[PDB]
Amino acid sequence: SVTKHFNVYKATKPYLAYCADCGDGQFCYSPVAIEKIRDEASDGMIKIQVAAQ
Amino acid sequence: SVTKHFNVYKATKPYLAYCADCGDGQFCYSPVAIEKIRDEASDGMIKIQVAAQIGINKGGTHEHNKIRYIAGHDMKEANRDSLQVHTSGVCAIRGTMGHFIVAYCPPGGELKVQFQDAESHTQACKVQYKHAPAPVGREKFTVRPHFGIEVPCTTYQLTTAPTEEEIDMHTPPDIPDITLLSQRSGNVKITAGGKTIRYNCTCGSGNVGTTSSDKTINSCKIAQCHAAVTNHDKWQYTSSFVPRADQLSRKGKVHVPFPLTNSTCRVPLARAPGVTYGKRELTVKLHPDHPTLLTYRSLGADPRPYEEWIDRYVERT
Amino acid sequence: PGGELKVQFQDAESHTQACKVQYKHAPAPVGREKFTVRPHFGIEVPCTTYQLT
Amino acid sequence: CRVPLARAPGVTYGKRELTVKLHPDHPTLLTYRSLGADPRPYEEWIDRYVERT
Amino acid sequence: QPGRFGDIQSRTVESKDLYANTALKLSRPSSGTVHVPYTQTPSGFKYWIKERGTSLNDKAPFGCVIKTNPVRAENCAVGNIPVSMDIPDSAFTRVID
Amino acid sequence: EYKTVVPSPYIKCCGTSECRSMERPDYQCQVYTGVYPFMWGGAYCFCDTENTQLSEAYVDRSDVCKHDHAAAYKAHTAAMKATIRISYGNLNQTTTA
Numbered sequence: 001s002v003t004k005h006f007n008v009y010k011a012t013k014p015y016l017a018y019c020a021d022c023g024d025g026q027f028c029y030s031p032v033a034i035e036k037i038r039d040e041a042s043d044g045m046i047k048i049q050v051a052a053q
Numbered sequence: 054s055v056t057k058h059f060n061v062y063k064a065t066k067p068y069l070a071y072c073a074d075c076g077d078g079q080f081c082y083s084p085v086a087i088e089k090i091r092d093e094a095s096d097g098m099i100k101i102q103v104a105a106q107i108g109i110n111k112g113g114t115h116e117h118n119k120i121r122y123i124a125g126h127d128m129k130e131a132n133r134d135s136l137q138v139h140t141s142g143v144c145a146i147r148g149t150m151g152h153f154i155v156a157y158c159p160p161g162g163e164l165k166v167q168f169q170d171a172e173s174h175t176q177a178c179k180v181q182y183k184h185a186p187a188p189v190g191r192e193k194f195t196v197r198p199h200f201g202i203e204v205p206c207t208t209y210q211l212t213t214a215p216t217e218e219e220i221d222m223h224t225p226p227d228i229p230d231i232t233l234l235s236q237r238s239g240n241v242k243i244t245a246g247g248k249t250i251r252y253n254c255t256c257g258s259g260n261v262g263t264t265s266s267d268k269t270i271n272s273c274k275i276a277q278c279h280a281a282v283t284n285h286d287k288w289q290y291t292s293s294f295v296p297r298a299d300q301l302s303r304k305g306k307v308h309v310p311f312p313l314t315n316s317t318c319r320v321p322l323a324r325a326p327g328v329t330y331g332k333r334e335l336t337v338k339l340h341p342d343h344p345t346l347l348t349y350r351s352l353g354a355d356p357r358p359y360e361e362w363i364d365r366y367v368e369r370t
Numbered sequence: 371p372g373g374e375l376k377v378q379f380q381d382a383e384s385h386t387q388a389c390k391v392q393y394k395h396a397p398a399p400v401g402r403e404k405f406t407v408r409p410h411f412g413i414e415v416p417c418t419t420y421q422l423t
Numbered sequence: 424c425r426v427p428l429a430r431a432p433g434v435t436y437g438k439r440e441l442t443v444k445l446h447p448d449h450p451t452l453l454t455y456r457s458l459g460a461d462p463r464p465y466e467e468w469i470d471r472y473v474e475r476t
Numbered sequence: 477q478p479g480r481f482g483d484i485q486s487r488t489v490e491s492k493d494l495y496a497n498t499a500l501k502l503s504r505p506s507s508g509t510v511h512v513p514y515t516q517t518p519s520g521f522k523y524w525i526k527e528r529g530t531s532l533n534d535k536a537p538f539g540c541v542i543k544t545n546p547v548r549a550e551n552c553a554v555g556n557i558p559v560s561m562d563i564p565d566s567a568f569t570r571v572i573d
Numbered sequence: 574e575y576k577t578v579v580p581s582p583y584i585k586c587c588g589t590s591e592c593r594s595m596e597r598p599d600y601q602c603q604v605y606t607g608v609y610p611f612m613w614g615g616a617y618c619f620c621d622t623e624n625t626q627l628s629e630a631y632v633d634r635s636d637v638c639k640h641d642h643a644a645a646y647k648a649h650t651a652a653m654k655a656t657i658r659i660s661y662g663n664l665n666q667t668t669t670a
């Protein structure tokens with residue numbers, strides 16, 4: 001019951017899409033892509049959505 | 054064919070010169086040393102000159118997991134992935150070969166290049182240098198746009214091709230070594246291995262500069278001996294940190310890689326300004342994301358130009 | 371120079387516990403000229419420092 | 424204690440007037456005074472190239 | 477002047493008689509180790525590039541967009557142009573229409 | 574831009590002076606005596622206060638002089654292109670004058 005709620009993660013295969021700067025190259029495909037950033041707390045809290053869970 | 058043009062790198066054994074701040078220490082002699090820096094690319098590129106060449110396997114080759122630093126009068130070994138360059142921010146390497154380094158790199162007030170040696174040491178040293186790039190276009194940014202326009206800029210493309218300008222090669226000077234003065238029974242002896250050590254003394258007769266011989270001067274003292282070793286085997290870069298003998302210098306040529314070429318260059322597009330015109334007067338609301346440039350002029354005979362960088366919300370009339 | 375001080379190390383197993391402290395470290399330069407790197411070629415003006423034994 | 428040494432300022436003397444061009448590499452200090460009874464001191468930090476009369 | 481602009485005023489790219497007035501000055505090395513001390517003002521070309529600003533494209537007194545290939549200026553209005561034309565008699569019909 | 578070409582410094586351990594001056598731009602013929610350089614091998618040679626330091630430098634153009642250079646020009650009488658479109662009854666054509 002501690003790990004039961006993880007069942008909703010049977011949805012799998014995170015995507016691989018375009019991102020801005022790959023570091024080594026100008027354009028590059030990476031499993032990590034920055035989705036729109038959540039920021040609504042009051043202690044510098046930052047939430048980042050990344051394809052690869 | 055691809056590796057055939059690395060024959061120019063038969064010249065090995067670079068110097069171990071003087072660099073200002075040891076990092077931890079105050080002064081040190083280090084295999085890595087910062088030399089002149091080239092900065093003429095218009096997209097924030099840099100060109101760093103380092104004595105220790107990279108991609109060497111005691112012969113011409115190209116790879117990505119081998120570096121041979123030099124400490125003393127012999128070669129050594131390390132790993133390339135441990136090589137790090139970083140200003141105030143992380144100074145990321147796009148790909149390097151030979152003596153020279155290129156990197157995407159954020160602005161800062163100093164430069165540092167570090168790399169792990171063979172065992173249990175992170176020896177390196179810093180250098181004073183300013184890096185304040187002037188981005189192309191009227192929008193200042195640090196990341197490539199997701200949507201934008203193309204305006205070309207100059208950069209160093211990645212290739213290994215011959216070029217026009219050149220660096221200077223010459224015979225190395227005669228470095229000294231005091232560890233070859235082992236005295237055992239009040240007698241001054243010369244060891245082996247290094248061989249052909251130049252000799253000169255006021256101790257007495259026998260000042261000839263022995264060549265690859267275990268010659269021993271008897272009834273002498275260490276304080277009167279100033280022997281120095283020479284090899285005349287492989288030539289070496291001419292820096293401003295080592296001496297030189299008067300001669301034509303026999304200028305050897307090793308082409309500088311990464312020449313300067315044009316390239317397409319993306320630049321962000323700012324949001325459309327808010328406009329609410331009235332009567333013979335115009336009012337504009339701005340929503341800048343980064344410090345940009347705004348300007349206007351009169352089509353009449355009197356231009357009356359205006360230019361003023363904008364980095365915050367402000368009404369303009 | 372910085373506005374906070376932190377020190378850390380890895381303990382016997384997979385942990386890098388640490389804690390910071392407020393400290394406005396703004397070292398006033400010695401001499402008429404500001405810098406961050408000792409001269410390549412320079413001149414000596416006497417000052418003081420800690421000793422290393 | 425080593426300390427940097429700035430480049431020699433570019434002096435181009437006029438008549439009863441002294442013009443100097445300053446090419447700083449780091450924020451430094453320039454001061455002057457008059458040997459007459461009234462000294463009229465001056466001090467002002469420099470961080471960019473500038474002309475002073 | 478040593479640093480204002482055109483400290484190098486060399487002629488065409490043939491690289492002959494590279495005049496320079498960058499005011500070198502050497503110094504005596506210290507007793508610590510080997511030195512090559514010198515004093516050298518920074519290049520005026522870099523300073524002129526850094527300052528730049530307010531190009532002539534945004535300074536044309538008649539809003540005259542300027543190009544650079546044959547160093548040309550395009551699409552600006554000033555004065556007026558005269559014209560004299562000769563028309564053949566076969567380009568139009570007679571009064572009977 | 575300018576490149577400051579400075580060769581390796583000249584140490585000669587005899588104390589006798591050696592001065593020369595060629596025709597390449599802005600040599601600074603400076604010779605120093607009584608220098609006692611050091612090196613990672615502790616030191617080299619024996620005699621102290623009797624050594625010759627010959628250090629020379631000059632300036633030259635840069636490697637990107639072919640691309641990153643700037644040009645100067647003089648104004649003169651100027652000729653103006655004019656692209657005109659002419660049309661009349663059942664005729665419509667452009668030209669250049």
Ligand SMILES: *[C@@H]1O[C@H](CO)[C@@H](O)[C@H](O)[C@H]1NC(C)=O
Nearest residue numbers: 252253254255256260619620
């Ligand atoms: C070192 O060699 C030079 C040149 O051969 C010679 O003049 C000098 O006397 C030598 N040193 C001693 C101590 O003899």
Ligand SMILES: *[C@@H]1O[C@H](CO)[C@@H](O)[C@H](O)[C@H]1NC(C)=O
Nearest residue numbers: 207312313314315316639640
């Ligand atoms: C870059 O473009 C300019 C202008 O078209 C040209 O003169 C120059 O030769 C080009 N350089 C390279 C390396 O393509």
Ligand SMILES: *[C@@H]1O[C@H](CO)[C@@H](O)[C@H](O)[C@H]1NC(C)=O
Nearest residue numbers: 658659660661664665666667
């Ligand atoms: C002349 O021809 C061009 C062809 O593109 C056309 O656009 C233009 O309207 C014509 N002129 C007139 C007056 O219709």
